[PDB]
Structure 1
Amino acid sequence: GGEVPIGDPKELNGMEIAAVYLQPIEMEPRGIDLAASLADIHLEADIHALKNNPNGFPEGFWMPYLTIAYELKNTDTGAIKRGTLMPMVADDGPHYGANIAMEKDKKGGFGVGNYELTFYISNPEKQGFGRHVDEETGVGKWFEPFKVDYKFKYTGTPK
């Protein structure tokens, strides 16, 4: 393995939205995220433009400036935690991600088991990103905030 897919990707609002996890990843700038040593997985959202995206993004481009909150629930134990993914880059391109404590989680209940993952996604305007709205070069309005849901079995840190 190396990279473990979470559920099936969704296509909505002119974007493909997939979720994957890796082993914990050391990040810079130092302190921008939970330390790899204190985590068990690195959760990623992969979000790219589809064909005929309605907001001016060419097919395949990364969708930047999104706000992505997450909710991770172990449905066996009831354990719930929430956070936000941050924009970042790996050698294979930009994405949104976060290091997450699972077995290391202090309240516990985030071990091996069945999970529900929710991403809550809001458009780039929230982060100061503009749209041309003239007749010749303008683009359509952005989507309203929305959620996408996945189910997956967590088997431990990929190795």
Structure 2
Amino acid sequence: FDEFPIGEDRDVGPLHVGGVYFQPVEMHPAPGAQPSKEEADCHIEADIHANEAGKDLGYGVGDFVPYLRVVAFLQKHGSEKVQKVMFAPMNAGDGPHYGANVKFEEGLGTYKVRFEIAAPSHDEYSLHIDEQTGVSGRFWSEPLVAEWDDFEWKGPQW
């Protein structure tokens, strides 16, 4: 399946973050309130793996980082409207990622695309912190941001 880049990959805190988009997909079960394959303009995927700093949190470097809460914000240049898109964790043929089928509500054009990545919720994940088996790192409190100021929505490339 052809993947198209959103922009340059980012390294933010303990995460390596990439963004791609491609034709809308059919997901099972259909996640949250996302548009159907027919209603969507495309599928946007956030590829999140631990980088070297991720090692202090106990992640294997280069591995997928689960239990995160990822939200994308889309804002067309010259517009005050901002779309807020909740990403969901899911598997495609090339493994897990956070993604969503999305509509570019203000049409064709240039958009600021921002991914805000929050650490797992308090009751959803833990870290060993004892000396013997523990980690020296901790999760981030303020959400990490990977953003692209000039993404071009030029319509389906399929």
What TM-score does the superposition give when structure 2 sets the normalisation length?
Answer: 0.88
Give the aligned residue type for 2:108. Answer: V
Query: Partners in 2 of 1:31 and 1:17 — Cα distance?
Result: 22
How many residues are treated as equivalent by the alignment?
A: 153
Provide the residue aligned with 1:22 in structure 2.
22
Aligned-residue offset at 1:118: 0.9
Aligned-residue offset at 1:34: 2.3
Aligned-residue offset at 1:158: 2.4
Query: Partners in 2 of 1:96 and 1:141 — Cα distance?
Result: 22
Contact (CA 8 Å) 2:12, 2:145: kept in 1 or not? no
Q: How does 1:1-159 map to 2 (within 5 A)?
A: 2-30=2-30, 32=32, 33-53=34-54, 54-102=56-104, 105=105, 109=106, 111-126=107-122, 128-139=124-135, 140-144=137-141, 145-150=143-148, 151-159=150-158
Give the aligned residue type for 2:109. Answer: G
Gaps of 5+ in 1: none
**What is the percentage of aligned positions where both structures have the same residue?**
35
Query: Partners in 1 of 2:110 and 2:8 — Cα distance?
Result: 15
Query: Partners in 1 of 2:44 and 2:122 — Cα distance?
Result: 23
Query: Partners in 2 of 1:157 and 1:79 — Cα distance?
Result: 22
Contact (CA 8 Å) 2:115, 2:147: kept in 1 or not? yes
Q: CA RMSD in A?
A: 1.8
What does the per-residue CA deviation read over 1:76-131, in whole Å, with 9 as the maximum and x for residues that have no partner? 454421121000000101000000123xx4xxx2x221110111111124461111
Query: Partners in 1 of 2:89 and 2:22 — Cα distance?
Result: 16
Instruction: Give the direction of change, closer, same or farther, for the CA distance of 1:157–1:127 in structure 2 (3 Å limit).
Output: farther
Contact (CA 8 Å) 2:12, 2:144: kept in 1 or not? no
Gaps of 5+ in 2: none
What TM-score does the superposition give when structure 1 sets the normalisation length?
Answer: 0.88
Contact (CA 8 Å) 1:67, 1:121: kept in 2 or not? yes
Query: Partners in 2 of 1:143 and 1:37 — Cα distance?
Result: 37
Contact (CA 8 Å) 2:85, 2:102: kept in 1 or not? no
Give the aligned residue type for 2:26. Answer: E
